[PDB]
Each structure stands twice: as C-alpha cells, then as structure tokens.
Amino acid sequence: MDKFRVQGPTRLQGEVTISGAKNAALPILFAALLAEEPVEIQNVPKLKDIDTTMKLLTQLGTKVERXGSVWIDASNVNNFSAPYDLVKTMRASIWALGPLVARFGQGQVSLPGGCAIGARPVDLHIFGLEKLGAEIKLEEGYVKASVNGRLKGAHIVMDKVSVGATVTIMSAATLAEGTTIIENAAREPEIVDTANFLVALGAKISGQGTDRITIEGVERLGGGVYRVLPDRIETGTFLVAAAISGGKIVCRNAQPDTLDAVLAKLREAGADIETGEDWISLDMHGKRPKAVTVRTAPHPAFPTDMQAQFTLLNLVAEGTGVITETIFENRFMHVPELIRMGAHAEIESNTVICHGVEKLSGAQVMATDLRASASLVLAGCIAEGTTVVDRIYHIDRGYERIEDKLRALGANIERVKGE
Ligand SMILES: O=S(=O)(O)c1cccc2cccc(Nc3ccccc3)c12
C-alpha cells in the first residue's frame, strides 16, 4: 500500500503540464463504439479506468491500441454484452449500452448492484433510452436494451441534471431517426467535449454546454482524430497548490474557460491570475490567501471536485470562510484529518466553517476520496515537518504521477512502498 511522505514547508513554484481529462476520455471512448471508421483519440491520460475501458471495448469486438493516444477500430464490434467481470470495478461501463443499442439494435450491460426496485443512477439512462424507443429488460443481472431498426428522436425532459444520462442519451441520439431535444442536460465541459467528438465523426449536435442539447440523428458515423480537453480539476488542484504556499505557477495545456468560477474564487483569495489560449498563471506574490465563501453547484458554477482543495485554502487563509457543499452535502472527510494537522474548523450541516491559521503541522493522514487525499498531500507540502499520506492509490486513479509534478514545483515528496 503506497504512501506519500512529505516534508514541509515548501513554496510551490514553477510549471505543470495538465493531462487530458479522464472524465472526458471515458465518454468519448464509449462513444467510439459508434464509429465505423478508425478513430485516434489524443491526449488520453494513463489511468486505471482507461485501461478498464479498453479491455471492455476489446471484449465487444473493438480493436484497441494505445501509447499518448488511444486508437480504435470498432468496424467489427461483434459481441454486444458487457459482462460482470469487466464492469465490476467501473460504473462508467454503463455507457456501452446506448451506443450498442443505437448502432446495432441490441446491447446489454451487467449491473453489479442488482436489478432490485428503488431509485438508482441507471434509472435516468433507462428513462432516456426508452424515450428513444428502446425496450429495456432487467433480467439475469443485466440491463438489456433492444429496438427494431433505428431509435427515434424524442423531446426528453430529464428530471435531474445527470452527466451520465446526458452522455447516454446524446450519444445514442446521434444515430436515431429524427431530432432529439434533451432538457435539463448536464453542462459539464466533458459533455461539450463528447459532443464535439461525436460531431467530428459526423453527428449533428448543438446547445452542448447549455441546459438544452439538440441532436439531429444521422444514419452512420465515420472516424477521425480528436484531442481530449485538459483536466480542469487537476488544473484547479495545482492552482490551489500555488495559492496556499505563497507560490507562482503556470499551468500548460490548460483550458481557461472550463474554470471561470474557480479562477474568480482564487482572485477573491488574493491571487494574481492571467490566462492565455492554453495556459493559466497564478502568482501569490508571496502572500497568504484571504478567506473566501464557497458554494458548490452544477457546472458552470463552483465545482464540488474542487471543494476539498478550497477547504484547505480557507484553513490556511487570513479570516473565517464558509464552504457549503450542495452536491454531496457530506463530502468532508478531509476536515478531521486537517484538524489533526492544526486546522480550526467546525462541520455543521452541509457546511464547514473555516477559521484560518498561519501554519499547519505534519501528521499521518488518510482519506479515501481522491480530491480530499490530494488536498492532504498539498497540506503536507505547506505544513511544518513530516506528513505521511496513506492509501494514495486513490490519487493515482485520477492524477498521473502527482508526486513528480509536485516535485517539479519544489515539493519534498517521496512515494514509499508498503511503508
Ligand atoms: O450501480 S450499478 O448499475 O449496479 C453498477 C453498474 C455498472 C457497474 C458497477 C460497478 C460497481 C458497482 C455498481 N453498483 C453497485 C451498487 C450497490 C452495491 C453493489 C454495486 C455498478
């Protein structure tokens, strides 16, 4: 069980090159099942879920190869069932369903949590596919979809904003007959990237990034080359790393417009920020951050995946600031660990009241959530002494070699094997 041993305090300064977003690469890799011609997906990070996805695609008959790119040939997909052993570690496997039924008229995906009645994430995917004309059967541990001929466009009102179901419905709609209009569509940049990838293959999609997406179906999709957009949360994490350590950083291979709310909140904390077409610079001019108010909400508002990192920023800031979590009004496990490093905070309801302190102290800490865990590593970089962050494989599933990128910024950090 790997751990990171960090020695602080260190001012983090320099540059970092942002990896492609795993959360955009995943939906794009599943959407590639729709492609009749070869596809090259560029800037794909090397992370576990990408490997899991490639193995699942291969089981369906797809030919897949990878390096920085992932090359796909789905011309001969010939098995339309995603089995239990290949889906059990990744809920995103459900994204194979829509493309399979849309292209081949049938598909099925194993459900590890069962088919028992009650409300589940898969419900909105089923809802949308049934609106497009698919018959959905929940039998023998699978969700199975089928349709005679092509799906048919429909006006679909999602009663909850859902990235997963938005992707399923938008992707399947690309091959339906007619027009599909998705209301209350998720607006995430990863949805916009998936939409633009589909358009690159020949789909017709507009409104992506807004609450309403319109897809005009076509008979078949082709192939091409598409580059996955930068990971905005990895970017935010490194910006916060500089913001809490009196540092200065330039993030390369970045996309500023995916972080409007984050950059505005960092400017409130006193950061001097500039942006270019593909870079963001942040400079604290050696100053401690000023406390800020944070309220998470659906994109384009402040992202819940940056909440832990901004909780840490407030805990070393000047002033009392409040973090309100509306998405997972209970994602606060980083708080008790930061208190053990000297932070002052009280969790009340779905909020954390932060009273900033000048300096944290090293401690042995651990969190399962990868953003809370990454926040603990950043805390170790600025705390006095030695910090040991345990179970960092969680971080490894979402960040490529974070210790190397942090070391390039001046951190004293070492990956220790089995302690
Ligand atoms: O949400 S499911 O559609 O079943 C589901 C679908 C596809 C892949 C899954 C992988 C792990 C866990 C699930 N759910 C789960 C939930 C409760 C207990 C055990 C497993 C997965």
Tell me the domain boundaries of the chain.
1-18+230-418, 21-228
Phi-psi region of 208 (alpha: psi -120 to 50; beta: other; left: phi over 0): beta
Q: How many CA atoms lie within 13 A of 155 on its CB side?
A: 0
Q: What is the resolution of this structure in A?
A: 1.7
Residue 93 C-alpha to ligand 1 middle, in angstroms? 10
Q: Domain 1-18+230-418's class?
A: alpha beta
**Spatial distance between the Cα atoms of 145 and 135, rounded to a whole number of angstroms:** 6
Ligand 1 binding pocket includes 91 (Cβ within 6 Å): yes
40 and 69 in contact (C-beta within 8 Å)? yes
**Spatial distance between the Cα atoms of 81 and 193, rounded to a whole number of angstroms:** 26
Dihedral in degrees, nearest 10, Cα atoms 265, 268, 273, 277: 30
Ligand 1 binding pocket includes 122 (Cβ within 6 Å): yes
Ligand 1 binding pocket includes 111 (Cβ within 6 Å): yes
Q: What is the DSSP string of 24-40?
A: HHHHHHHHGGGBSS-EE
Atom of ligand 1 nearest to the CA of 87: 8
Burial 129-163 (b: 16+ CB within 10 A, else e): bebbbbebeeeeebbbbbbeebbbbbebebeebbb
**Spatial distance between the Cα atoms of 22 and 26, rounded to a whole number of angstroms:** 6
**Spatial distance between the Cα atoms of 70 and 62, rounded to a whole number of angstroms:** 12
- Matching fold, domains 1-18+230-418 and 21-228: yes
Residue 272 annotated as binding? no
Residue 294's DSSP bridge partners are 323
Ligand 1 binding pocket includes 94 (Cβ within 6 Å): yes
Among 185, 211, 215, smallest CA distance to 199 is for 215
Q: For ligand 1, atom 11, which residue shows the shortest CA distance?
A: 88
**Spatial distance between the Cα atoms of 126 and 76, rounded to a whole number of angstroms:** 26
147 and 135 in contact (C-beta within 8 Å)? yes
Q: In the structure encoding, which two tokens stand for residue 246, read together?
A: 């009196």
Ligand 1 binding pocket includes 85 (Cβ within 6 Å): no
Residue 282's DSSP bridge partners are 249, 273
Q: After which residues is the chain broken (C to N over 2.5 A)?
A: 67
Residue 124 annotated as binding? yes
Q: Which amino acid is at 78?
A: N
Residue 111 C-alpha to ligand 1 middle, in angstroms? 6
In CATH terms, the superfamily for domain 21-228 is Enolpyruvate transferase domain (3.65.10.10)
Q: How far apart are the first and last CA of the chain?
A: 7
Q: For ligand 1, atom 6, which residue shows the shortest CA distance?
A: 111
Residue 153 CB partners (closer than 8 Å, separation 6+): 132, 173, 176, 177, 178, 179, 180, 181, 215, 216, 217
Catalytic residue check, 115: yes
Helix (H, G, I), strand (E, B), or coil: what is residue 379?
A: helix
Atom of ligand 1 nearest to the CA of 112: 4
Helix (H, G, I), strand (E, B), or coil: what is residue 191?
A: helix
Residue 111 parent element (H or E): none
Residue 167 annotated as binding? no
Residue 272's DSSP bridge partners are 283
Among 1, 403, 400, 340, smallest CA distance to 412 is for 403
Q: In the structure encoding, which two tokens stand for residue 238, read together?
A: 């490194």
124 and 162 in contact (C-beta within 8 Å)? yes
Ligand 1 binding pocket includes 87 (Cβ within 6 Å): yes
